[PDB]
């Protein structure tokens, strides 16, 4: 049990605007010794194993249940939207040392389960924001699905 993340997706085909709003995470795994976590969220736009664009939220202090409500937009033309992935990672911030990922999920091309459902709902409903919860998964597994 790594925790859960809630985000919205919205796609506008004419403008080729993909919006991701990071809403909140809950039940996060504790990554600090004797503490909770200092979580933040990274969003990557990917295609064919390549990281195209990267965005990140602010960092929340001393919480396993952060609220963000931070919006991010990407330019993805309508002739490409079906071929990209959006990867959402929750990490624990440390002032010194590599920030450890808690877990991650991806939506879009090659996505599965509830992630595929969320993406399909976005595509089927132009201009409509659609919010959904997702269970975080270990990075080893998600990265293997996203690679080369």
UniProtKB/Swiss-Prot annotation:
Belongs to the synaptotagmin family. It is linked to Baker-Gordon syndrome: An autosomal dominant neurodevelopmental disorder characterized by infantile hypotonia, congenital ophthalmic abnormalities, involuntary and hyperkinetic movements, stereotypic behavior, poor or absent speech, EEG abnormalities, and global developmental delay varying in severity from moderate to profound. Behavioral characteristics include sleep disturbance and episodic agitation. Residues 1-134 form the C2 domain. The modification Phosphoserine is found at residues 71, 73. Ca(2+) 5 binds at residues 32, 92, 94, 100. Calcium sensor that participates in triggering neurotransmitter release at the synapse. May have a regulatory role in the membrane interactions during trafficking of synaptic vesicles at the active zone of the synapse. It binds acidic phospholipids with a specificity that requires the presence of both an acidic head group and a diacyl backbone. A Ca(2+)-dependent interaction between synaptotagmin and putative receptors for activated protein kinase C has also been reported. It can bind to at least three additional proteins in a Ca(2+)-independent manner; these are neurexins, syntaxin and AP2. Expressed in melanocytes. Glycosylated. It comes from Homo sapiens (Human). It is found in: Cytoplasmic vesicle, Secretory vesicle membrane; Cytoplasmic vesicle, Secretory vesicle, Synaptic vesicle membrane; Cytoplasmic vesicle, Secretory vesicle, Chromaffin granule membrane; Cytoplasm. This is Synaptotagmin-1. The chain holds residues 273 to 420 of 422 of the full protein. It comes from the Eukaryota. Ca(2+) 4 binds at residues 32, 38, 92, 94. The gene is SYT1. Homotetramer. Heterodimer; heterodimerizes with SYT2 in presence of calcium. Interacts with SCAMP5. Interacts with STON2. Forms a complex with SV2B, syntaxin 1 and SNAP25. Interacts with SV2A, SV2B and SV2C. Interacts with RIMS1. Interacts with PRRT2. Interacts with DNAJC5 in a phosphorylation-dependent manner. Interacts (via N-terminus) with RAB3A. Interacts with SYT12. Interacts with calmodulin. Interacts with DNM1 (via C-terminal proline-rich domain (PRD)); this interaction facilitates vesicle fission during clathrin-mediated endocytosis (CME). The first C2 domain mediates Ca(2+)-dependent phospholipid binding.
